[PDB]
Amino acid sequence: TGKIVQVIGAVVDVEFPQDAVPRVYDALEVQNGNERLVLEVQQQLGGGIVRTIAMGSSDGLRRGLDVKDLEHPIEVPVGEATLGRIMNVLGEPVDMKGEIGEEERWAIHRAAPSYEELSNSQELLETGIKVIDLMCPFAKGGKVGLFGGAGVGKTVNMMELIRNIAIEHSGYSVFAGVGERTREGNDFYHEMTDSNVIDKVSLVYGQMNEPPGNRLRVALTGLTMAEKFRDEGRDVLLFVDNIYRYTLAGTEVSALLGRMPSAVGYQPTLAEEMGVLQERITSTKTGSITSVQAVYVPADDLTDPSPATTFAHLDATVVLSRQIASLGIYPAVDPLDSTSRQLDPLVVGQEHYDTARGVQSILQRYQELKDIIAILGMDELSEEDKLVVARARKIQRFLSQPFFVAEVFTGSPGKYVSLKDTIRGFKGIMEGEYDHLPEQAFYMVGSIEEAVEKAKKL
Amino acid sequence: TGKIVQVIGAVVDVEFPQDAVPRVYDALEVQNGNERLVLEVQQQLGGGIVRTIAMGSSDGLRRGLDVKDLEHPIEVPVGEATLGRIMNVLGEPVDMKGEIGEEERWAIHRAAPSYEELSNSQELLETGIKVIDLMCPFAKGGKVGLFGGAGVGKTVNMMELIRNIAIEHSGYSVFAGVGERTREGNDFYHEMTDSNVIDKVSLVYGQMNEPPGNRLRVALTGLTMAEKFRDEGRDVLLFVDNIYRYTLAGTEVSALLGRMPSAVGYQPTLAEEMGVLQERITSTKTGSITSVQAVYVPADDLTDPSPATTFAHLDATVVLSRQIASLGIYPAVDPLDSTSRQLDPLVVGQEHYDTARGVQSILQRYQELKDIIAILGMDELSEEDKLVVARARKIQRFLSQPFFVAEVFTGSPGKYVSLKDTIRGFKGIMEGEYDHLPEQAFYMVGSIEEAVEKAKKL
Amino acid sequence: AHNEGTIVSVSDGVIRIHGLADCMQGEMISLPGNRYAIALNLERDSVGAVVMGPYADLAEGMKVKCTGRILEVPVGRGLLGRVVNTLGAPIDGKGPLDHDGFSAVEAIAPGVIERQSVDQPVQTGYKAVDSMIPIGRGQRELIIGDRQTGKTALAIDAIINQRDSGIKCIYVAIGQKASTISNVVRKLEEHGALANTIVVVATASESAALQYLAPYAGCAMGEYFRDRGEDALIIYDDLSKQAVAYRQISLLLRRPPGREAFPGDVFYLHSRLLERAARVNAEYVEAFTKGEVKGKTGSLTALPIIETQAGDVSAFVPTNVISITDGQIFLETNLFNAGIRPAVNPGISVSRVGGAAQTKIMKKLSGGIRTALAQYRELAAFSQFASDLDDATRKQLDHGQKVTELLKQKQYAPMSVAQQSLVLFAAERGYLADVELSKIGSFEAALLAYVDRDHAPLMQEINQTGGYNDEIEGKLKGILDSFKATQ
Amino acid sequence: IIYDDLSKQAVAYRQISLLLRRPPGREAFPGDVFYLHSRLLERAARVNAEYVEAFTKGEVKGKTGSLTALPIIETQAGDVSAFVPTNVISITDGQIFLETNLFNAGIRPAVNPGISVSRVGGAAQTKI
Amino acid sequence: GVVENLASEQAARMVAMKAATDNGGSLIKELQLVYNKARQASITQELTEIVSGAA
Ligand SMILES: Nc1ncnc2c1ncn2[C@@H]1O[C@H](COP(=O)(O)OP(=O)(O)NP(=O)(O)O)[C@@H](O)[C@H]1O
Ligand SMILES: Nc1ncnc2c1ncn2[C@@H]1O[C@H](COP(=O)(O)OP(=O)(O)O)[C@@H](O)[C@H]1O
Ligand SMILES: [Mg+2]
Numbered sequence A, B: 001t002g003k004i005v006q007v008i009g010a011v012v013d014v015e016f017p018q019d020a021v022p023r024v025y026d027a028l029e030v031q032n033g034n035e036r037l038v039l040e041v042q043q044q045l046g047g048g049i050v051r052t053i054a055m056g057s058s059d060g061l062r063r064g065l066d067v068k069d070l071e072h073p074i075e076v077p078v079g080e081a082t083l084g085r086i087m088n089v090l091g092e093p094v095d096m097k098g099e100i101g102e103e104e105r106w107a108i109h110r111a112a113p114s115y116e117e118l119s120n121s122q123e124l125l126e127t128g129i130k131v132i133d134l135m136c137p138f139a140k141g142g143k144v145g146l147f148g149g150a151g152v153g154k155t156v157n158m159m160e161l162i163r164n165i166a167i168e169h170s171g172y173s174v175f176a177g178v179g180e181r182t183r184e185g186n187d188f189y190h191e192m193t194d195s196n197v198i199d200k201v202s203l204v205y206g207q208m209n210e211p212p213g214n215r216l217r218v219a220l221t222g223l224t225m226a227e228k229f230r231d232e233g234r235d236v237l238l239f240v241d242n243i244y245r246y247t248l249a250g251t252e253v254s255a256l257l258g259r260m261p262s263a264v265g266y267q268p269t270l271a272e273e274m275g276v277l278q279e280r281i282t283s284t285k286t287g288s289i290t291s292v293q294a295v296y297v298p299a300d301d302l303t304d305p306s307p308a309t310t311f312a313h314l315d316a317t318v319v320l321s322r323q324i325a326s327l328g329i330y331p332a333v334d335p336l337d338s339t340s341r342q343l344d345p346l347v348v349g350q351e352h353y354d355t356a357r358g359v360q361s362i363l364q365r366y367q368e369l370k371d372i373i374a375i376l377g378m379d380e381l382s383e384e385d386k387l388v389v390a391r392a393r394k395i396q397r398f399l400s401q402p403f404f405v406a407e408v409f410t411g412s413p414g415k416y417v418s419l420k421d422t423i424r425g426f427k428g429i430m431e432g433e434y435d436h437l438p439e440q441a442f443y444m445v446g447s448i449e450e451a452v453e454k455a456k457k458l
Numbered sequence C: 001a002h003n004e005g006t007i008v009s010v011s012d013g014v015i016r017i018h019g020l021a022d023c024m025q026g027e028m029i030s031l032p033g034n035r036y037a038i039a040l041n042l043e044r045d046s047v048g049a050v051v052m053g054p055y056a057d058l059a060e061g062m063k064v065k066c067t068g069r070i071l072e073v074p075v076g077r078g079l080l081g082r083v084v085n086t087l088g089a090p091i092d093g094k095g096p097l098d099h100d101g102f103s104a105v106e107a108i109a110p111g112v113i114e115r116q117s118v119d120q121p122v123q124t125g126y127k128a129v130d131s132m133i134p135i136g137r138g139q140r141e142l143i144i145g146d147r148q149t150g151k152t153a154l155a156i157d158a159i160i161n162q163r164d165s166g167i168k169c170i171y172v173a174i175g176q177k178a179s180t181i182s183n184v185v186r187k188l189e190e191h192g193a194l195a196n197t198i199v200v201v202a203t204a205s206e207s208a209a210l211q212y213l214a215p216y217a218g219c220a221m222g223e224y225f226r227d228r229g230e231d232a233l234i235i236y237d238d239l240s241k242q243a244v245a246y247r248q249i250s251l252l253l254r255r256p257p258g259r260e261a262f263p264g265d266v267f268y269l270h271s272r273l274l275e276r277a278a279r280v281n282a283e284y285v286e287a288f289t290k291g292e293v294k295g296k297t298g299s300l301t302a303l304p305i306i307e308t309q310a311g312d313v314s315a316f317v318p319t320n321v322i323s324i325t326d327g328q329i330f331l332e333t334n335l336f337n338a339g340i341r342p343a344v345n346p347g348i349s350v351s352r353v354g355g356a357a358q359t360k361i362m363k364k365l366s367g368g369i370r371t372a373l374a375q376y377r378e379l380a381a382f383s384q385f386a387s388d389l390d391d392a393t394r395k396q397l398d399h400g401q402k403v404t405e406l407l408k409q410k411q412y413a414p415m416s417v418a419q420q421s422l423v424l425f426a427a428e429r430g431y432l433a434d435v436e437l438s439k440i441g442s443f444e445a446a447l448l449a450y451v452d453r454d455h456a457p458l459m460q461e462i463n464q465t466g467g468y469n470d471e472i473e474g475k476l477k478g479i480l481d482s483f484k485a486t487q
Numbered sequence D: 001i002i003y004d005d006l007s008k009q010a011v012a013y014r015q016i017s018l019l020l021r022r023p024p025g026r027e028a029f030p031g032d033v034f035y036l037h038s039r040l041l042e043r044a045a046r047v048n049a050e051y052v053e054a055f056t057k058g059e060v061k062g063k064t065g066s067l068t069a070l071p072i073i074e075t076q077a078g079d080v081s082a083f084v085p086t087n088v089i090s091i092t093d094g095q096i097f098l099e100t101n102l103f104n105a106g107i108r109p110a111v112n113p114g115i116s117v118s119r120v121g122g123a124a125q126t127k128i
Numbered sequence E: 001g002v003v004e005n006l007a008s009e010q011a012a013r014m015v016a017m018k019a020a021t022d023n024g025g026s027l028i029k030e031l032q033l034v035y036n037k038a039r040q041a042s043i044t045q046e047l048t049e050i051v052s053g054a055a
């Protein structure tokens, strides 16, 4: 019931009879010959007119085209019918398989859950990767950030978190590929079907080449799915692939929409955008949605607004390191800088907090010793010191481990380790029983029980 | 034929009603307070009006006076008839002899030669300058560029190049000062008239004193002469003072021409305004063009757009830094940030190459040690690195040499070094032959045998 | 609705047209003369278009006809030896276009499930890149660095090493200087690589629309090979010059500028251009007419080239491109000016495909270099204070200096995966540890390389198979022991 | 003639330029700030016998007039590589850097040699 | 001779170290300027591109 008046890039704007005219964030259908592409109302400027963004390519569109005013905002299939395959920003399947089994068809748009939700909540989700559990305990409704530059292993680490929580526990996983690469989207889908994991994992891709308005909403879509699983009363996880590409995509929208830039050219609403995306992710009275999200850092600068506004919302932060990875350790996390707002004794037990700080302590002392070891050699350390260094060297390799999703790379068999095996391992290895076996025993293994085995082959 | 509608600095727009809307690039005159005033059409603004640029002082133009439109783009003479003396941007005889001039005539606006019509050679010419010949050579049919902030000898460098290669020339030269001091031009004319070398040169002068219009067009009127000489006689020299003054002119106007500002307030058309002019200078199948030109760098910022984009258009790019001048080295070339596309082993022989890159390396290795020296003193270097800085500091001041043209304001008589000697000396110092000599032995001398004799006196 | 329109205003290669009510986005628009324009900005009661060519002749009132489809271009096996325009117009010299069919410049990239996981290598020839920043078909490595760090030299050198590997090449020169481009292809001819690579061109003088479209045109030409179960390698030289051209357009069209006055959709521009490059599953047998078997797989590897100013790798355009490409090779101007010629900087560089896009033997023996290099990275600080440290860590420093002195080659001298022998067994034992001093640590390279051409049957063997286990290792061990009975 | 503080002029011109809404450039100065100083200092020069004759209408009939001009630029913290200072240096055919620390230490004609120059040089001086 | 040379070391060291501390202090003064320059350039450009961009 309306006609395109102007069109610039993905910024098509449509006119209507006054009253009735589309609410903001309202959906709009429109044919351009080949297929119908959707529009999302963004600004109800002037009388009768409305500014919108093309969800698909705005090419081919022309003035005077018929734009059908739909009623609701974006529509997306939710519920277990979604688990099982890929689907773009707005519900429709891209995997060439059947059509979405069923939908109550929720809107991608939100409402902050009133602060009536069941914290206290310490359920210490066991991942269970030794280092990401020993150093970074996180609870349901919590959100974990994976920090690092390119190639550190944020995405692959997420793949493991999915597979482990999927098969060793209940699946409950929604993967929002905000502006995700296509190659990654493929290897991910394949790797997920290779293992039994694919259900539950409802994939929601928003390929890089899709318009900004498209990539922006991809987060809310995958969010809305897990947003309903919590309504069903189950503890689901949610992996947003790149918090950076979320804010950045949101930058393009604000840009061509004409808003005045702010910090570093980011949208003048960066705080609120991140605000709503992050705030619905919590543990409600009925259920819970926990999240682990890859936070890319531009130029390895934590002052950049993107990872900056992210920090305020993380309950735990797992920093990965490009240099740690180079040296061969592939759960490439720095134990010294990885943190958790939950890693205190009365939350995670004394044994956990003690051996945690201990690994931290010893890793640190080695760092100090490392200086004198180069300048005046190893022979200078006291017997107790060169014992600390041997014992530290060991725990370093121990907290590395072969991921299951990593077999396509290394070929070795991946291994899941408990929280109690891990603590039982590190505590002993530093007290320290396993002094009689060479480092390599701890290189890539489950609990030390396996390390002692490899030590026999040695 | 038409009348004025607006006047804003150099930009005046004229109403001409439909019948004869001036072609985009086209001339037209106006009677002001006294004399003729050529405007150049720039934009066919909608409504039968047209934007132009005053090729003279826009002061004294009424808001309504009539303007005649001609069909000629720009009237500039070309050929041997021009060799005699100085010209205007309009192709008028600015000197005191009513020009005999044109047997023909060309427009200052031209197209870049066809791709397959472009030639190239590798016959390197030899400048007197030791730095240039060693660090960055060029064959005839080359594009050399002299980058430098204010007061780094920018002009005197070009004039010394001129006196060195305008002799081996035996051909037709075309100097084209643009946005420069008029005092230099007067001296260059008188100096060249006494040496009687004017009859093979050809002047054209758009001063930094003249209005904007003259400057951004005088660069074109300059090479359109060299182009004529090219499309007949084969070997021409083209010297241009400050291509920047041309771009800079286009910036003073870009605002009034009514286009949004690019980065740092530059025109959005910087990419093309440069390329058009810069792409014109080339070796045709019919005849080649050797050309050096003084590209100014604003506020010493080599990242400033003018220099940044200008770089790609140069075969050899020698750059003068204020830091090297602040020392006393007055061919103030930074031998590190200065390079040529033809410092190729297959082109300049292996001995020249290895010597050039050898000199380049040790000079760079020195820049690294420069830091620890300043904080912890010389006595902290290894006996090897100690020798590195010593040998480097010899090179660093053997790069220097007094220019003939520079005798005027400095007691030091000039010198001219063989491309052969330049290799002999530096190769030599690097081998460790001339070590015993003090540093001052190398500062401001010709061949190495001068450094030797100077060491005797002191 | 109306088919025609008239020119209201014309300036800076941009035309604002009245009427032309029937007109699509990005649609072609035939002007008087032969040249067209592009409808990029259809506001109400006026449509701005970018003239794809000179614009001086155009004027007010001129009748401007609407047209059918969008920008298309000549694509096919025939373009190989030729240098072509952005429109596919041969400025080469041969004259006629031996082209097969046409194809849109702007067209969507193959979605998921149509992709095949990348796992086969494309050798750049450089010991440095192929060993620690491996590239593979269907990948996109971002070559990035300051001016004069050796970017292009790396690019066309990677192209030259495909002169024999079966991959077809494309070279999109953008904003470049004509004199330079001819120089390049002239060298593509000195080596047998020119008859195997189409060179698209958009000189510094061509219209903003022509430069801005040059990459996409050269893409559709390369896509041809991938869509038909074949591999190709396109390299967009100066993707920076492209964005500055598109910035010129968006500014003249009065669009809102973001940081550095660049259009907000600049990321989207490069985004869709680069997602175009990828490996596609054999089941792309369904093509223009499914489908002349076609049991093969196809792909399109593309390494773009960003130019940073003063190392500012956080600038607008660089930030975007780095975020997009699944890997990037950082070239440092400091490494370069020093002597380390392939000025690649490990540790900062990355290749998210890694071991997959690498031959079997390389995958094994490159692991030793990656960590040996990484340790030298940690001790680099003590290099100033060397001799202050005990022999334990002192030796690790020497090994590092040598191993980085090993990863450096002359420009036009690609290596034979016998570079394998050199690199691999530089790490295995300090065959460099003897007789280290770095001056000889390279002349040994050119000596081990040619005494293997002495007994190279056991060498072309390792070359073709692209694999190693233990026998071959055993042989390799002896080949070096046997070596130092020479020179 | 000596123009006291061309720095105070350029800043005054920048005021009007920005009030007129003219797009700022480097250091917020209008792009034509070079032309501002350029056409001014270019005025200062030596006119030969013919020009003086033509202007004088044959009254002077054989003499050369001249306008020597030395302007003043006030740098901040010795930053000589600033925008305005660089332009005025690019214009003038010579300069005289009065160093801030040479001045403090009693050397009152604080002229810094090795950096100060007069490109006209030799000709500009008497024989002795 | 050794034991005395050693007492000379401690002195020459603490003296030459005071020099290094003062050299660093001078660099920190020069750097602080180079910084304040960039600090200004940065804030003028960000402000200028926003306002001129809006237009
Ligand atoms: N491996 C190498 N060994 C020796 N010289 C090299 C090597 N690689 C590049 N060069 C030289 O480095 C110089 C510049 O290389 P080039 O590839 O043109 O850099 P570029 O960054 O594309 N510079 P530009 O594009 O003009 O800004 C050339 O003279 C090359 O010959
Ligand atoms: N356990 C592992 N073994 C080998 N390689 C790994 C392992 N884990 C991660 N990687 C490497 O990480 C690289 C990129 O993974 P990715 O997580 O996508 O990087 P990023 O987090 O920066 O996006 C891969 O090429 C892969 O080789
Ligand atoms: Mg990732």
Ligand SMILES: [Mg+2]
Residues within 6 Å of the ligand: C151, C152, C153, C237
């Ligand atoms: Mg290049």
